[PDB]
Amino acid sequence: MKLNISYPVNGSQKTFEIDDEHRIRVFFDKRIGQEVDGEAVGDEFKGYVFKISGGNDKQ
Amino acid sequence: SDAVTIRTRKVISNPLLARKQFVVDVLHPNRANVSKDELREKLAEVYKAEKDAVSVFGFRTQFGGGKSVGFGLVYNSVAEAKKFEPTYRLVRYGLAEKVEKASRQQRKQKKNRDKKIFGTGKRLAKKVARRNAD
Amino acid sequence: ARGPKKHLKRLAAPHHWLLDKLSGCYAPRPSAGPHKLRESLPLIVFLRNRLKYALNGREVKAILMQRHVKVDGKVRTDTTYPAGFMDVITLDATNENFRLVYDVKGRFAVHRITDEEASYKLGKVKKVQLGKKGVPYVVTHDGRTIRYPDPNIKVNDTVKIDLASGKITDFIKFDAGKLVYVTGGRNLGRIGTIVHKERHDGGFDLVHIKDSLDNTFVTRLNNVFVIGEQGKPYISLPKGKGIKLSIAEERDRRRAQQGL
RNA sequence: GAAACUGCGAAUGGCUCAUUAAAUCAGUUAUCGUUUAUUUGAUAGUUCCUUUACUACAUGGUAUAACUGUGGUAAUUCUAGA
RNA sequence: AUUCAUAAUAACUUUUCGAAUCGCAUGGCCUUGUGCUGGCGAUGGUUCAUUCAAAUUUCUGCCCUAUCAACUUUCGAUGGUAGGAUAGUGGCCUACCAUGGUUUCAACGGGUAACGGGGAAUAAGGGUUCGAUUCCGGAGAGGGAGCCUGAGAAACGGCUACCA
Ligand SMILES: [Mg+2]
Ligand SMILES: [Mg+2]
Ligand SMILES: [Mg+2]
Ligand SMILES: [Mg+2]
Ligand SMILES: [Mg+2]
Ligand SMILES: [Mg+2]
Ligand SMILES: [Mg+2]
Ligand SMILES: [Mg+2]
Ligand SMILES: [Mg+2]
Ligand SMILES: [Mg+2]
Ligand SMILES: [Mg+2]
Ligand SMILES: [Mg+2]
Ligand SMILES: [Mg+2]
Ligand SMILES: [Mg+2]
Ligand SMILES: [Mg+2]
Ligand SMILES: [Mg+2]
Ligand SMILES: [Mg+2]
Ligand SMILES: [Mg+2]
Ligand SMILES: [Mg+2]
Ligand SMILES: [Mg+2]
Ligand SMILES: [Mg+2]
Ligand SMILES: [Mg+2]
Ligand SMILES: [Mg+2]
């Protein structure tokens, strides 16, 4: 599923794709606003904290 | 071509529209009605204003021949006709081009097509361009 | 039916305008203003249908928007502005002044007046109340509000209004024997001094009127508009002087003036 | 001067006669029984504060469209995060 | 015709309005501060009046029908009191209380291939028949109900639900 990530300090954005049910899984049952650590989702993101802000489903 | 004779009845000095307005009574024996251009040119040559400031119209020739009766205008300037004249009239004369446009229902449709877009459009050009990958 | 009505089908338009049945469909609906719909003469009508100064309605906006026309003093730019009885219409260009007063047929006549008379107007006072803070006001038939009138000004009296400034400069009481102009009913347009008032508590006072032909009629007090003293109007009257000739008398006047 | 915000309008018009028989409608009344955009005419010296160490009036606050940019859906005048 | 217009007293208010707005012009004034003044008219603004309205409302007037004679209070029918609600009167709604209201001078019920009116047709007169339909009024937007916006809609080229 696509992650649409923003770095509001810089004004940047780029998307990232993930084909890993286990990595993906970390975001499950979390809500908008809840914070999420990085290393789980990818080693790229080791450290990085993400705030979940929204998104679309299929349809 | 036969004496003609152009009369002008019921005349009125009309200062709040910068012109003198009147009826035109054209006798024309042995002449199958006169014409608007001949009448602008002659009424110009009498009201001391010049052709392109005279306006003529209405006009229907009398039953059985002989006479036609119209209506005439004559502005104080060529700048005052060009501003107080209906724009289809200046067209008839040759002192304003017929700016042609699309159909009336071509235009309406464009208005409506345009209603389905919010904002600029080009923002929607690029985003629809990505579909061309999926 | 849901809200304010904005159109007027010609045919429903008031007759004293004299619009032709055909050529269109709607008549101009008078704007909200100083005179009731049904007793008004919109600028469109005056500039084109009476003065013949405009041929189009589109040309009437052309004339107006140059502020050529100005009502009761002020400039005014509203194709269908509700001009009304006693108002004063002015064209600076063409050096022309006008008053709206009635025919004998109950129509608004083209009546030319002097620059001098264009100074002022006449207003029937329609109510006199005590305003907020104890300031007394009068209110005239054309809906002007005027603060601090003379105490002896009561309802139905007529009033000479400055125009240039809003103030009052005179008032004629409603007494037996005072020049009157009739503003409604059949007797609309007639003129005649006043004989006597039928009181009638709680429902329409009748005003018996006689003119300068020793002819007599009657209207509701609502329809009666004082304008001075017998002999002495306070404004110039139209030719006719509001005397009403029989259909016979009118026939003869028109066929006595026959030889070109 | 596009776009967008703001304001106003979309309660007029046009169409039809299904319902409706004291209803509607007509003529005639009433508001000392109320609402009223607008037009027109009037209409406002007072706003702070235990009232000498004083209050932005030379004019106080952000949050948003359009926009830039990242996106979602087969699909609409759908719209999300930044 | 009023407890009216208007004003005065004691207070009350999640305190309404009392211009932080825009355009053309740029001039006067002396203690020379970029001081102090100041032209035309836009948009706005509270209250009142006016105008365009609206909403209710008085009196009288409707086609056929008794093989419709009694009708009205189930769960307001008719009135009184107080309140609530409304823009506001009012059983409009709710409490309490009472027993009223309409009818052979045809109530109540049924029918209408019934929207009303201005009008139309037919020509001795009296009448008879018609009016979906150019103007006025009313109602509706497939059927019902609900409501947002707003000065104004119970709006449908508005939304919401149910039914088709
Ligand atoms: Mg077009
Ligand atoms: Mg657009
Ligand atoms: Mg109008
Ligand atoms: Mg009365
Ligand atoms: Mg309509
Ligand atoms: Mg905020
Ligand atoms: Mg009081
Ligand atoms: Mg200066
Ligand atoms: Mg039966
Ligand atoms: Mg019996
Ligand atoms: Mg009661
Ligand atoms: Mg009970
Ligand atoms: Mg009982
Ligand atoms: Mg019977
Ligand atoms: Mg029917
Ligand atoms: Mg009909
Ligand atoms: Mg009928
Ligand atoms: Mg039918
Ligand atoms: Mg409706
Ligand atoms: Mg249908
Ligand atoms: Mg139903
Ligand atoms: Mg609806
Ligand atoms: Mg509609």
UniProtKB/Swiss-Prot annotation, chain A:
Transmembrane segments: none
Location(s), subcellular: Cytoplasm; Nucleus, Nucleolus
Subunit-level organization: Component of the small ribosomal subunit (SSU). Mature yeast ribosomes consist of a small (40S) and a large (60S) subunit. The 40S small subunit contains 1 molecule of ribosomal RNA (18S rRNA) and 33 different proteins (encoded by 57 genes). The large 60S subunit contains 3 rRNA molecules (25S, 5.8S and 5S rRNA) and 46 different proteins (encoded by 81 genes). Interacts with snoRNA U3. uS11 interacts with MPP10. Component of the ribosomal small subunit (SSU) processome composed of at least 40 protein subunits and snoRNA U3.
Family: Belongs to the eukaryotic ribosomal protein eS6 family.
Function text: Component of the ribosome, a large ribonucleoprotein complex responsible for the synthesis of proteins in the cell. The small ribosomal subunit (SSU) binds messenger RNAs (mRNAs) and translates the encoded message by selecting cognate aminoacyl-transfer RNA (tRNA) molecules. The large subunit (LSU) contains the ribosomal catalytic site termed the peptidyl transferase center (PTC), which catalyzes the formation of peptide bonds, thereby polymerizing the amino acids delivered by tRNAs into a polypeptide chain.
Other information: Present with 66000 molecules/cell in log phase SD medium.
Name of the protein described by the UniProt record: Small ribosomal subunit protein eS6A
Source species: Saccharomyces cerevisiae (strain ATCC 204508 / S288c) (Baker's yeast)
Classification of source organism: Eukaryota, Fungi, Dikarya, Ascomycota, Saccharomycotina
Full-protein interval shown: 1 to 59 of 236
Swiss-Prot record, chain B:
Region ranges (Disordered): 101-134
Function: Component of the ribosome, a large ribonucleoprotein complex responsible for the synthesis of proteins in the cell. The small ribosomal subunit (SSU) binds messenger RNAs (mRNAs) and translates the encoded message by selecting cognate aminoacyl-transfer RNA (tRNA) molecules. The large subunit (LSU) contains the ribosomal catalytic site termed the peptidyl transferase center (PTC), which catalyzes the formation of peptide bonds, thereby polymerizing the amino acids delivered by tRNAs into a polypeptide chain.
Biological processes annotated in GO: cytoplasmic translation; maturation of SSU-rRNA from tricistronic rRNA transcript (SSU-rRNA, 5.8S rRNA, LSU-rRNA)
Record's GO cellular component terms: cytosol; cytosolic small ribosomal subunit; mitochondrion
Entries under InterPro entries matching the protein: eRP_eS24_sf (IPR053709), Ribosomal_eS24 (IPR001976), Ribosomal_eS24_CS (IPR018098), Ribosomal_uL23/eL15/eS24_sf (IPR012678)
Record's keyword terms, sorted: Acetylation, Cytoplasm, Isopeptide bond, Phosphoprotein, Ribonucleoprotein, Ribosomal protein, Ubl conjugation
Protein name in UniProt: Small ribosomal subunit protein eS24A
Primary localisation category: cytoplasm
A GO molecular function held by the record: structural constituent of ribosome
Modified residues (N-acetylserine): S1
Subunit structure: Component of the small ribosomal subunit (SSU). Mature yeast ribosomes consist of a small (40S) and a large (60S) subunit. The 40S small subunit contains 1 molecule of ribosomal RNA (18S rRNA) and 33 different proteins (encoded by 57 genes). The large 60S subunit contains 3 rRNA molecules (25S, 5.8S and 5S rRNA) and 46 different proteins (encoded by 81 genes).
Modified residues (Phosphoserine): S13, S55
Miscellaneous notes: There are 2 genes for eS24 in yeast.
Highest taxon above the source species: Eukaryota
Compartments, record wording: Cytoplasm
Organism of origin: Saccharomyces cerevisiae (strain ATCC 204508 / S288c)
From Swiss-Prot, chain C:
Main location: cytoplasm
Phosphoserine modification, residue list: S31, S246
Key words, A-Z: Cytoplasm, Isopeptide bond, Phosphoprotein, Ribonucleoprotein, Ribosomal protein, RNA-binding, rRNA-binding, Ubl conjugation
Domain S4 RNA-binding, residue spans: 41-104
Cross-link (Glycyl lysine isopeptide (Lys-Gly) (interchain with G-Cter in ubiquitin)): K61, K133, K160, K167, K173, K178, K210, K232
Pfam families the record matches: 40S_S4_C (PF16121), KOW (PF00467), Ribosomal_S4e (PF00900), RS4NT (PF08071), S4 (PF01479)
Other noteworthy facts: Present with 573 molecules/cell in log phase SD medium.
Protein name, as recorded: Small ribosomal subunit protein eS4A
Lineage summary: Eukaryota, Fungi, Dikarya, Ascomycota, Saccharomycotina
